Copies of this chain bind each other. A is one copy, B any other.
Amino acid sequence: KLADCSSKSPEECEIFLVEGDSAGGSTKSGRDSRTQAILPLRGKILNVEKARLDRILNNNEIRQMITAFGTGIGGDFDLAKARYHKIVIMTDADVDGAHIRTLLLTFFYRFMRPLIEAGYVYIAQPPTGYKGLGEMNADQLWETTMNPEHRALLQVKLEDAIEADQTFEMLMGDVVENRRQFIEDNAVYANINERNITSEMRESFLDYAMSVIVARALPDVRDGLKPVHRRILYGLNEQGMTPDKSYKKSARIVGDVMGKYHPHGDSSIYEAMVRMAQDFSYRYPLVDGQGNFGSMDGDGAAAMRFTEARMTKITLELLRDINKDTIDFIDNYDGNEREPSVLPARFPNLLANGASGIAVGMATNIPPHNLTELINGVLSLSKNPDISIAELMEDIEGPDFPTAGLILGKSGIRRAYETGRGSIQMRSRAVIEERGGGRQRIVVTEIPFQVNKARMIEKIAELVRDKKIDGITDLRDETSLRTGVRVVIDVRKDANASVILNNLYKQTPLQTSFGVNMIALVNGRPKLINLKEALVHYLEHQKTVVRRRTQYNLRKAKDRAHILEGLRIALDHIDEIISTIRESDTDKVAMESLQQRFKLSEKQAQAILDMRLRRLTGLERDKIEAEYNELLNYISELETILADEEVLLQLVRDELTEIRDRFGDDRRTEIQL
């Protein structure tokens, strides 16, 4: 990995740590290879503050850093033996780079403290607006960042130790609550110089943490999506990949999304897209995949060069009226594109499909739900702001998993909908049945959500082999496209099969809990929310969307009647119209002449100058009158909706109801007492 310098005189020698060979290459090409060494790492380095020492000392990248510095670790640490008097951290100028920087400072503080004391550690300052240093040309990387003349390094000073120790403990240690508190306390949500090592850690760390929270791992309460899923669906949309049209190569989709909207690795995008295609993961799948999109047995999808994809019908409902000023667009990562900040989301997607995400200081875990039940819930809520969770549960019985199965008891469900937290006990659907000669078997035909069917079956085998469960004489996955899931467990003759089943439910994922933890972005801040808040924020979104959409169609039909007004004047005075144009030299004079003569606006004048001659035929004259008369009718319909809060809300209901009628379906998961 190391690409060393010529000079062995450590006095004048620098080593640069970079994230991988992609940056490595640019760095190598632009360095001064007499004084300047380069060590590429390989992504996130190990967190030494949370890891056992066995594996701190085995980890490659840790090891190689040790070798390169040649000073040994901890007690047996000779400053005098530093092969370099400058260790320069130069990760990418993105948030994951800030995080890899915190990880490294932690390693150095806890294993090479003197190195920091001695003033040998530094932080390079590459320009922003660059995914990694691999996107820079070597000359740029040199001028800006590496050239001893016209560059700016921060030298890491350690002031108070005690404070440093607490900081590393809080930020990087395994007590989440300490970290969570710091985030809350310091996050500001939207509506050779010395650098203190504590200052750097808290600023770098918070930068990462906030970024993961608002812009990675948590879904938005309004549309139920994380950034990656939003930019995927929105890309499908901008490229017209509707279900009527045909499937397009995943690589096209991914390439496009990566380029315009999502400056991150290919596999994060493709894997997100894949899940959205899996009817064992999504209760209402958002992508329609062609090819191998993986199995319940933990199989990956085929590589993105093989598969293809489009929207499902129901994703249309997520995107409807996105170009009717329903929702605010923002700048993409680099200035050159516009992306939606949220989707219209005309059905309640946060709950329908659920969410899961590991952030920093917190996580989220929201189960999926029956859409017929959810919309009935939003209906009841719309007729009654003061409805209770108990009343809402009259409609929303509890979660509805794609994989079906059983939930045991209404009581975890109730806590989760009331507090935002609760454990939910899920079981497989298993029956006991004769197989012949007075012997029996267990048949599992549905397994709990998020359980790998293979791993589950291996577990049972590994219980039968470690002689750790009695009575089982065979185990077979008879699952098949033709017959559905079907896992068979033969039972020894005369053994009690019900007992064996209970044993499996105790000792295998045949029974599994689901720990609800309903954190989402509300005003782009993380909040633990109950069932009713989820539906309130959802309905508040829908109200705004149907209002803005109605306001937009008004401005637009008004703009258009205005033009049809110019054109009807034209048709009534066509001879004089022709005359005015013919007697004009420029287009500028005609425009002025038509405004004055016939009291037309600039826009009308221009639309008349744009009329083609074929529009003076019989049918074309009629269409202009017809389009105009239909449009006045529509304009006054729109005005009705905007002048009356109750007609608007009634529209919201009628629309929800239509979606419930077209996409609603049976409950799959049975909830038992």
Contacts and interface: CB of A to CB of B under 8 A. Distances in A.
Interface of A: 6, 21-26, 28-34, 131-139, 142, 248-249, 251-256, 258-259, 264-266, 290-292, 294-295, 297, 299-303, 305-308, 476-481, 574-575, 577-578, 581-587, 589-590, 608-614, 616-620
A380 B615 CA distance: 60
Contact of A295 (B25, B131, B137, B589): B25
Q: How many copies does the complex hold?
A: 2
Given A585-B617, A590-B614, A611-B613, 13 more contacts: A25-B295, A25-B299, A25-B300, A30-B481, A33-B478, A134-B303, A249-B255, A252-B255, A258-B305, A578-B578, A587-B614, A608-B613, A611-B612
Contact of A613 (B142, B249, B610): B610
A13 to B, nearest CB: 15
A398 to B, nearest CB: 31
Contacts of A619: 585-587
A284 B98 CA distance: 40
A135 B26 contact: no
Contact of A614 (B30, B300, B301, B610): B610
Nearest to A476: B6
Nearest to A588: B617
B617 A295 contact: no
Contacts of A24: 299
Contacts of A583: 618
A290 B137 contact: yes
B26 A305 contact: no
B266 A258 contact: no
Contacts of A31: 480
A86 B307 CA distance: 29
22 contacts: A21-B299, A22-B303, A25-B299, A33-B479, A33-B480, A131-B306, A133-B292, A134-B302, A134-B307, A135-B290, A135-B307, A248-B259, A249-B255, A249-B258, A258-B305, A574-B582, A578-B578, A578-B613, A578-B616, A581-B614, A586-B618, A586-B619
A299 B138 CA distance: 14
A302 B248 CA distance: 27
Contact of A132 (B22, B301, B302, B618): B302
Contact of A249 (B259, B292, B577, B584): B259
Given A582-B574, A619-B586, A302 B480 contact: no
